[PDB]
Design a protein around this ligand. Structure first.
Ligand SMILES: Cc1cc2nc3c(=O)[nH]c(=O)nc-3n(C[C@H](O)[C@H](O)[C@H](O)COP(=O)(O)O)c2cc1C
Ligand SMILES: Cc1cc2nc3c(=O)[nH]c(=O)nc-3n(C[C@H](O)[C@H](O)[C@H](O)COP(=O)(O)O)c2cc1C
Ligand SMILES: Cc1cc2nc3c(=O)[nH]c(=O)nc-3n(C[C@H](O)[C@H](O)[C@H](O)COP(=O)(O)O)c2cc1C
Ligand SMILES: Cc1cc2nc3c(=O)[nH]c(=O)nc-3n(C[C@H](O)[C@H](O)[C@H](O)COP(=O)(O)O)c2cc1C
Lengths: 310, 310, 310, 309
């Protein structure tokens, strides 16, 4: 019984890892991931220049999950780029994901062109739950802009590239998004980013400072949505585009369900934030237990094999 | 300490009621709501002709909430219309909500024109999470069609009308939706319908029969989203358009938070489905307790008074 | 023949040390300063959180000096604060300078308040060549904001504090700056930071990456300006505010001239960057030689005794 | 390969010349510039009435440059005005720059109005890098006064006019200065005047008499600042306002870099003071050499073409 897996041409000893933005601000945190039972890590989403992010507190936990409005705090793309480039050289080095996005499309290209010109050859995750022009929703909710960006990107970008996606909630939107993604040599899509713009109240006051208390929701609230997005894209995307599943994972069972829906790799945000890197050991065991009980030996035995009723 | 409230020019002895689709299929169920501590009821969403709805099972509970794909089963608009018209005449009659929608825009107009021509003078709730033409999302996710429908509707419809809305998850979508709704003499908006197209898995198999197991999510999963939508519209809509809050209500605290966000009336779906009409007694007590502890006497003392952080 | 000196109530075995930003990124570099003939060190200018600084190359040498646009890279205030706090405990510990600034006035106060609350009791150098709001020059070129900041700072800050200053070039500016500084219990001012926004060309291309090639100039270019600023403030500031002299020091003679102008302590940037900590040994000898030849025994014998022409 | 150039509607055989204040006190010195390889000259900065300037010594050299506090010594505006007016008539006459300023704004207008009413039609350089009123910095460091002066000036002054500028050291100041200058039909700006108020020490004593030893710095110290100012304005000013580059020029390479930054004309102060008019021959050759090696034929081939990394 093995939880080994692959994304594109890359192997991983395990199929659990951090979700972008969680436990990946610094070289130290990343190393802690790398030395945990996690199969990989993804860097903090990096922008062209470093960012302090939003005023505190910008994160709060709940009995059910979390709410956050970080504002893309990070030490700058160069910091993460150099670090993952440098880890390539070392032996026994795990494969990693470099998460990035610009505050504007132009900045996004500047960043990608840097990565293209660099010595990094590993996986890149473009975060499309990102800022657009005024009067326009986050980029992945703007199919015209999403298509335009991906089109431009692939005229120059040759490294393995996947995209981080916000959840969709309508069949027609899944169809439309997939018709776009299928055009491009994407290595993967990652479903899902937070459920956007939720509101959490403690007493009569919001629990985070930025954005009037509105923030991305993660954790238990999110699993039905996460699994739906993973499955919906699994059923729609050309098989050359793999799916990373993110959202609501706190047990091996949750990870199992993501893989069942089609995920090749599972990411943990909220629960990792709450439990620390030890969580990988625990969840890996819980997943493997389910596989054993089921007689599954590799992910391949059940990945995408979710059953309809009757 | 009073939980009386108003929507438009209508009074209610209480500010809790059923959410459309739950416990409102028949005259009997409706009467049970009417004789509970609920301040009102809303009818099953009625279509021009009666509908059987989707294959069973079309509803499942979870530790956290519910998932359903009913397919708008109902006894037909005439059934509910006649019933709520007839209740107007009776003494000690509570005000009610007639929920309706067509399977097509044309059908929707046919229905509204019937209600317009009828003797009913009470509140009407147009359900805008309704079927669109192929290649188009649910109507409320299609602002162009939403605006066109509401525009047509108000050229003839003179009765008090509110709209049932799906959740939005993007600031720009709130802005765009509000810019549309504000144009019209809407009595209220009702946030929110189910979180659309979630997926629930028991074992290795989806738990509902219709739509490959995809369905509307309600209950605990949904409150952050529900509260956000209520508040987001509260801060955007002209005050002549009130807000009914729906989603994640299972305690007085949950209702309290909805009212805090701006809701004038709170609806219960999943929890009512699980607990039965007795839930109103319980939740009313729990809400009143919070008001007492806080020194609030009417909803007016705290409605819309949600606080940002220092 | 002694080059001992004092700043406020603190003694130093020598009157030469590093300039902020040079050879002081890490505990290791600082220790190398501490074990050199330097009389003290000043930490890398620390911000609230660590910063990567600007893209490389961000520094270039010239036959005459240096040009740089670092962007305040540093390991964060806590790193330097803890380090100098911890050195206090040691015996034969030299007195040090903690350099700091926020990216915004509010951040500056947050940092100072941390230092105030800490166990550090040594000298602090607030770098007043920091970002201002848009359409506003560096802070020390904005007398209104400078006065406001210093005013706020001294309502809570009780530790010995000096300010690092950019050069001024106009008599009236010296007067205006001095009239502000004199109001406050500043321990010292440090003249000067780089000559701002110089441009160096190699062939037909600028020699640094950030800011279109524009950067702070240090080294030989700067001495006339540096000496002028030291002297100009020496002749204007209440004697309770001492002067640290920085700029263009590469020989004992240069240090000598700074002390002649009034400096109690002399700092080396560019030349230290070029020659390493060994430079203190050399320059100290060269200074002492001048003192010997002149019959001077302590700095007091010539400090501030620059002569006008007959 | 040609170092010809233009400022406004005026041509010059060469793109090197003296900086105001250096080698231009008298008709004789000016003529020596005119007969050198320099493409032009600018007169000593003239005031309404002649001035002796500050006590001596008011100038000192250094291994790196110079420091001075002249105090605007000059033979009076009328002396320079008459001389450049008179040179206009001659055939084969080079175009020149008449540098002037009043000790007060009112005096500045009186002078400009004289030039306006005169027969001189050549270039005028108004020196804004020197002070005027108390509790207030030199004029060009006082944007409100600078804008007021230029506004008044252009209600009456119709001759080609440029301004001599002190260096700025802040992006916002460049923006603010440029937002002023761009309003006006300035023919050019000249960057830069001395780095103000530097201090030079020899042994234990300042090396100039006036102002406690404080003075304008020129020469090697200044080039990074000079080039930055030239470039910063080049990138900001409407192209109808050309840039003359001054500061740190001692080789063809230095002049080359100024032109690269945007300068249409380059001026030499300190190095000219040190080497005499022969310097133009030398620097012209050194510049032309760089142009040849680069395959440049006119200034136009590289002016303003400085590259980022
Ligand atoms: C505190 C926090 C910060 C996050 N930051 C980012 C980010 O910077 N970039 C990104 O693409 N996703 C970011 N996410 C998205 C997480 O991956 C999100 O929680 C995940 O997509 C949902 O997983 P979960 O249910 O385990 O929280 C962040 C999530 C959290 C909780
Ligand atoms: C079984 C079921 C049927 C529903 N039918 C309708 C409906 O016909 N029309 C409508 O607008 N909402 C319908 N809803 C949405 C409920 O109003 C929904 O649950 C509510 O909007 C979310 O609140 P909750 O979290 O309390 O369940 C239905 C919900 C459920 C669970
Ligand atoms: C590479 C470099 C980095 C610097 N960083 C800082 C800094 O962080 N804070 C500060 O106040 N000055 C900083 N400075 C200014 C130095 O203190 C500067 O060179 C000194 O003020 C000028 O002296 P110098 O001629 O010896 O170089 C830096 C200078 C250089 C060359
Ligand atoms: C001795 C001396 C006298 C000067 N007199 C004037 C003057 O009267 N008016 C003026 O605008 N600039 C005057 N300047 C400024 C020169 O134009 C200045 O040196 C030039 O702006 C700096 O360039 P440099 O490095 O080639 O010397 C004088 C400069 C020096 C060195």
């Amino acid at each position: 019984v093995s939880t080994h897996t692959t994304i594109g041409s890359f192997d991983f000893d395990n199929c659990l890892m951090n979700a972008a933005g969680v436990y990946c601000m610094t070289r130290e945190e990343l190393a802690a991931i790398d030395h945990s039972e996690a199969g990989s890590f993804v860097t903090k989403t990096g922008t062209l220049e470093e960012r302090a992010g939003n005023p505190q507190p910008r994160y709060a936990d709940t009995k059910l999950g979390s709410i956050n409005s970080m504002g893309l705090p990070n030490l700058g793309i160069n910091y993460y780029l150099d670090y993952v480039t440098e880890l390539q050289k070392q032996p026994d080095s795990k494969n990693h994901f470099l998460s990035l996005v610009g505050m504007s499309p132009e900045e996004t290209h500047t960043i990608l062109k840097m990565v293209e010109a660099s010595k990094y050859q590993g996986l890149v995750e473009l975060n499309l739950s990102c800022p657009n022009v005024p009067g326009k929703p986050q980029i992945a909710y703007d199919f015209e802009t999403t298509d335009q960006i991906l089109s431009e990107v692939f005229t120059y970008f040759t490294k393995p590239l996947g995209i981080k996606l916000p959840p969709y909630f309508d069949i027609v939107h899944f169809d439309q998004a997939a018709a776009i993604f299928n055009k491009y040599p994407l290595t993967f899509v990652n479903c899902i980013n937070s459920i956007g713009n939720g509101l959490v109240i403690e007493d009569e006051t919001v629990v985070i400072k930025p954005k009037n208390g509105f923030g991305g929701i993660g954790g238990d609230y999110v699993k039905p949505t996460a699994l739906a997005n993973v499955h919906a894209f699994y059923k729609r995307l050309n098989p050359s585009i793999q799916i990373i599943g993110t959202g609501g994972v706190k047990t091996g069972r949750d990870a199992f369900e993501h893989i069942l829906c089609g995920a090749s790799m599972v990411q943990i945000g909220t629960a990792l934030h709450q439990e620390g890197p030890q969580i990988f050991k625990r969840i890996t065991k819980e997943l493997k237990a389910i596989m054993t009980e089921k007689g599954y030996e590799t992910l391949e035995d059940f990945r995408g094999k979710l059953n309809a009723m009757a």
